[PDB]
Amino acid sequence: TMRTINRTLSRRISRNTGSEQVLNLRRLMEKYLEDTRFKDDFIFVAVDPNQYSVPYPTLVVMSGAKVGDHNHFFGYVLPLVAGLAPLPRREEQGPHGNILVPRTWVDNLNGTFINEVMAAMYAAIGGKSNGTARIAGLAVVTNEITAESAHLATTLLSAADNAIQ
Amino acid sequence: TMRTINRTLSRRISRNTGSEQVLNLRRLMEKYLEDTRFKDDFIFVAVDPNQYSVPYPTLVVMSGAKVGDHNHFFGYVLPLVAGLAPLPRREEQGPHGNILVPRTWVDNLNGTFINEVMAAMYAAIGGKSNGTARIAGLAVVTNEITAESAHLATTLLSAADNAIQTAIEIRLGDKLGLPQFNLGMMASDQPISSVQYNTSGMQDSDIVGNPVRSDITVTISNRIRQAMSDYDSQQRLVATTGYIDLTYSPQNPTFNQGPVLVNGYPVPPTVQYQPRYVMTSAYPLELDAFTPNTFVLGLIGTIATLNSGMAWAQSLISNAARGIGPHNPGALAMVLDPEVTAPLDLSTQTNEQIYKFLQQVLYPSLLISIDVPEEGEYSWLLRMIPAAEKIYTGKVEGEVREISEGYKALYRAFDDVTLGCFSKKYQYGLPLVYATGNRIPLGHYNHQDGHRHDIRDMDDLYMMNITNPDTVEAWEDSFDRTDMTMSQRVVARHEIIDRVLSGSWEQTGWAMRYDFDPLALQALIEAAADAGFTIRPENIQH
Amino acid sequence: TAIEIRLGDKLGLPQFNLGMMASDQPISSVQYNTSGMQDSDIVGNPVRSDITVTISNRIRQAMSDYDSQQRLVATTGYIDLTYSPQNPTFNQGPVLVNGYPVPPTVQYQPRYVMTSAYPLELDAFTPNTFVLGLIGTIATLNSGMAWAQSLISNAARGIGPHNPGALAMVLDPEVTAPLDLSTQTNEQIYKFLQQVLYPSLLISIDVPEEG
Amino acid sequence: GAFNLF
Amino acid sequence: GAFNLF
Amino acid sequence: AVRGNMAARARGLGNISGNIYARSD
Numbered sequence: 020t021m022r023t024i025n026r027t028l029s030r031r032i033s034r035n036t037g038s039e040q041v042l043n044l045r046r047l048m049e050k051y052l053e054d055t056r057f058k059d060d061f062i063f064v065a066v067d068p069n070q071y072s073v074p075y076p077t078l079v080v081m082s083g084a085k086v087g088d089h090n091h092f093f094g095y096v097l098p099l100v101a102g103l104a105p106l107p108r109r110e111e112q113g114p115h116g117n118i119l120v121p122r123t124w125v126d127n128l129n130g131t132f133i134n135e136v137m138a139a140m141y142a143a144i145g146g147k148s149n150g151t152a153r154i155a156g157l158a159v160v161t162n163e164i165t166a167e168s169a170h171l172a173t174t175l176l177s178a179a180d181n182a183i184q
Numbered sequence: 185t186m187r188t189i190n191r192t193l194s195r196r197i198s199r200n201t202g203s204e205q206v207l208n209l210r211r212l213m214e215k216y217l218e219d220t221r222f223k224d225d226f227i228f229v230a231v232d233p234n235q236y237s238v239p240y241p242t243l244v245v246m247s248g249a250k251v252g253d254h255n256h257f258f259g260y261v262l263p264l265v266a267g268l269a270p271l272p273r274r275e276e277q278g279p280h281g282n283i284l285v286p287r288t289w290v291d292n293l294n295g296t297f298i299n300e301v302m303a304a305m306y307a308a309i310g311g312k313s314n315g316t317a318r319i320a321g322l323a324v325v326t327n328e329i330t331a332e333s334a335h336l337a338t339t340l341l342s343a344a345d346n347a348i349q350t351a352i353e354i355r356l357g358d359k360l361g362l363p364q365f366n367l368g369m370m371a372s373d374q375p376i377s378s379v380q381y382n383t384s385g386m387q388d389s390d391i392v393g394n395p396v397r398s399d400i401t402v403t404i405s406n407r408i409r410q411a412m413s414d415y416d417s418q419q420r421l422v423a424t425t426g427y428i429d430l431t432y433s434p435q436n437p438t439f440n441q442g443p444v445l446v447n448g449y450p451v452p453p454t455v456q457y458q459p460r461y462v463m464t465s466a467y468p469l470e471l472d473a474f475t476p477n478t479f480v481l482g483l484i485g486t487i488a489t490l491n492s493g494m495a496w497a498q499s500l501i502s503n504a505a506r507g508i509g510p511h512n513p514g515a516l517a518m519v520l521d522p523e524v525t526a527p528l529d530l531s532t533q534t535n536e537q538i539y540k541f542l543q544q545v546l547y548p549s550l551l552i553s554i555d556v557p558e559e560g561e562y563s564w565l566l567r568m569i570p571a572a573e574k575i576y577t578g579k580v581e582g583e584v585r586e587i588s589e590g591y592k593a594l595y596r597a598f599d600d601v602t603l604g605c606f607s608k609k610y611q612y613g614l615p616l617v618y619a620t621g622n623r624i625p626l627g628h629y630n631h632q633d634g635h636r637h638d639i640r641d642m643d644d645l646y647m648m649n650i651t652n653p654d655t656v657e658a659w660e661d662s663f664d665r666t667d668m669t670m671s672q673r674v675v676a677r678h679e680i681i682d683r684v685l686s687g688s689w690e691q692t693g694w695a696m697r698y699d700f701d702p703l704a705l706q707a708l709i710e711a712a713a714d715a716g717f718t719i720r721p722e723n724i725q726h
Numbered sequence: 727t728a729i730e731i732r733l734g735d736k737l738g739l740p741q742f743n744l745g746m747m748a749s750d751q752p753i754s755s756v757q758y759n760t761s762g763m764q765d766s767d768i769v770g771n772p773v774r775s776d777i778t779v780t781i782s783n784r785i786r787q788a789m790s791d792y793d794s795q796q797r798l799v800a801t802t803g804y805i806d807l808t809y810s811p812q813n814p815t816f817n818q819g820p821v822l823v824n825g826y827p828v829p830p831t832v833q834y835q836p837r838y839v840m841t842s843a844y845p846l847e848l849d850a851f852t853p854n855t856f857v858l859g860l861i862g863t864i865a866t867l868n869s870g871m872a873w874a875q876s877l878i879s880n881a882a883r884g885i886g887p888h889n890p891g892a893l894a895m896v897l898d899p900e901v902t903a904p905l906d907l908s909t910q911t912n913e914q915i916y917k918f919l920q921q922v923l924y925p926s927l928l929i930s931i932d933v934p935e936e937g
Numbered sequence: 938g939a940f941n942l943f
Numbered sequence: 944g945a946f947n948l949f
Numbered sequence: 950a951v952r953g954n955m956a957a958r959a960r961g962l963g964n965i966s967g968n969i970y971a972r973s974d
Contacts, residue, residue, distance in 0.1 A: 020371070034339060186746060195850055458957050
């Protein structure tokens with residue numbers, strides 16, 4: 020009910036419009052790579068809650084290696100959480116009674132999230148018959164990404180490359 | 185004569201040329217709208233003193249709605265006053281003689297101004313035969329508008345749109361089939377609340393950009409859990425700000441009366457001050473629309489949170505940790521013992537010790553009050569509280585006295601939010617709101633930490649900590665004496681503030697203070713519970 | 727202005743006079759500020775502005791009842807002291823101010839120094855406009871001893887370069903440290919000042935050699 | 938007066 | 944759980 | 950006369966119903 024309150028009680032002009040962090044970060048990374056000789060070594064995969072069961076917008080950086088006739092792919096996962104409300108407290112069971120325990124961003128990254136990311140990665144490369152996929156790292160980005168954040172994008176790309184290699 | 189002095193004694197090159205705020209603001213709004221799909225839904229009307237009898241340059245934002253074959257138009261008025269000289273003082277008549285009373289921008293917006301604005305609006309749409317026009321809100325903009333003020337223009341446009349849409353809904357919802365918020369929409373989820381006590385640093389700001397006192401902040405949210413994937417999230421709805429004040433109220437045992445009982449319990453003989461909570465603002469967070477029903481939800485949440493285990497006294501306890509300062513509760517040691525002449529330092533005491541100290545001087549209850557601005561972003565919404573103060577029109581009754589319309593509107597809002605349980609809990613015709621009769625100034629001054637602070641920082645505790653006892657007596661007397669007219673109280677408070685601050689401050693507007701009936705509030709909480717609504721505060725300590 | 731003064735009679739150019747303020751109500755205001763930034767000149771250099779006086783005009787619409795004011799001219803200055811002991815031993819009569827004798831311990835004469843004067847909403851500034859500013863300043867500063875408020879306001883900061891409590895060393899020779907008066911009421915400070923200062927004001931002005 | 942203005 | 948996640 | 954505000958004491962809100970709070974478990 021309350022999830023669609025804005026559609027029920029609507030207004031023409033809204034003060035909150037949101038942003039496109041995944042579009043901004045992907046654009047910066049591709050712009051950096053377009054002049055070097057490693058244009059074709061990386062694949063960027065966008066996962067958003069509108070089509071996959073994930074809690075935050077994420078970007079995946081993929082690269083491959085071939086042994087014999089088989090292909091192996093490795094990915095680095097980057098959830099972007101700037102601008103979202105913080106997590107509420109969870110009620111647990113104690114020896115005396117009930118307690119409320121704090122949570123943070125990482126507490127939402129469970130097995131379902133891993134399964135969804137793997138499915139997106141497999142759809143990116145072509146299918147199960149086109150290779151094998153594995154996760155190589157994970158990091159949460161808590162600061163906003165704008166069109167003037169080239170340095171941060173370059174640093175993140177370097178970290179992903181080192182982990183994959 | 186003197187009005188045209190420049191034309192008589194003229195010079196070729198002038199240092200003062202003025203600006204075109206109405207042209208700048210209209211251009212920004214139209215530029216924002218030109219790319220969306222609502223280009224033709226708005227009409228902008230410019231009113232300037234050169235052709236209409238108005239005191240300031242103003243801009244009007246209009247929009248319409250059609251029922252049957254008739255058109256209805258609603259407008260939002262924006263006077264722009266940056267760069268003009270402030271108003272002078274007006275001489276009035278008093279019991280002893282003549283007094284000079286301060287004025288501000290809103291004092292010039294009388295009936296003549298309304299008539300002129302209406303005439304301009306009618307000329308805009310075509311004539312009387314082309315529809316009907318009504319005013320939906322008013323706000324004064326005190327900051328300059330330049331070619332680099334896109335954000336402010338967008339915010340003002342959003343406020344105007346919300347006000348116009350709410351007016352259309354309230355007036356024609358039944359015929360147009362437009363719903364309104366009620367507690368039944370929160371049936372399948374879990375509401376929660378949180379509170380923050382902060383008093384050092386920057387304060388909250390309004391739509392123009394002026395500070396607002398925000399000692400206590402309460403947030404009402406909604407808790408969500410995914411069914412299969414087990415993710416956790418929350419959705420934030422509405423927020424509220426305010427602070428805590430004190431009112432002198434001695435108990436008289438010598439009148440051969442019974443002891444004072446609070447919750448059926450007697451109090452120590454040394455208790456003489458009554459705590460009071462003052463609400464300063466309320467605004468939405470992720471909701472697009474803000475209506476009177478949403479305001480009722482915010483009020484319910486705030487009342488529930490502030491009474492959760494005496495959570496309001498935490499504000500004073502937290503303030504006591506800084507030590508000597510303008511908000512030190514240790515100044516009450518001078519009230520308790522007359523010989524003591526210096527405020528006490530309580531920064532080395534434990535929380536329970538401070539609580540025990542407070543229990544000797546304060547009543548264990550809270551008074552709920554609110555400040556209603558005479559103009560502002562949400563004054564159109566909040567004007568319903570003053571309207572309900574007069575219960576009965578004195579019109580002749582065949583049997584039962586007629587009841588006024590403002591009272592009806594407030595009662596109807598309370599009953600509709602709770603799905604009809606308030607009517608069964610509270611009798612129709614009992615009081616809901618009382619008037620105190622005090623006119624409060626709005627403004628700001630320069631703080632020693634480098635920020636601008638709300639002028640409402642001057643209260644009873646400030647006077648106890650900073651000034652001498654004569655000033656404290658004068659301040660309390662202007663707040664409480666019943667044989668003083670409104671202008672006399674305004675003059676007394678203005679004089680004290682001017683002496684304390686050395687005249688370095690700026691005034692922007694006026695506000696009036698009202699308080700609620702405790703029986704009505706208790707009935708409202710009970711009715712909300714009977715409709716299936718529960719809340720779980722998440723931050724309360726001890 | 728030079729053209730007007732030299733050739734007004736032949737060119738038919740008028741000049742300001744008090745007859746143009748006949749159908750309105752003049753008003754005035756004063757501000758005492760001594761902490762922070764100061765006033766500036768045309769180049770951008772600071773000017774001492776302990777006291778500021780503003781002269782305006784009050785207007786009311788006849789039918790619509792709107793209220794407004796029109797600001798004409800402003801003036802800045804400060805208060806100084808001049809040593810001037812009284813000699814009783816010369817077999818002369820006592821010193822009388824406004825026909826009243828003064829206590830034997832009074833030995834300093836207050837002085838007001840004007841530092842600048844400039845227009846606000848007037849386009850033209852001539853010698854007649856300067857005379858209007860002078861009249862307004864004199865009327866305002868003598869309205870109930872309003873000039874002593876400057877010293878009283880300065881006394882609230884405590885120990886500092888503008889503390890009037892330094893006169894305690896003049897009053898009593900043994901005292902060797904300036905006094906702190908930040909915990910006294912206004913009437914107490916006024917009574918303290920009445921023992922050392924003459925109850926009158928001297929009007930002076932600083933004339934720059936170029937500007 | 939402001940409350941009853943419009 | 945994070946350590947054994949992947 | 951006597952200083953103070955006598956009506957302010959009578960308008961204080963003391964306690965509210967406990968059914969508005971969410972039950973544990």
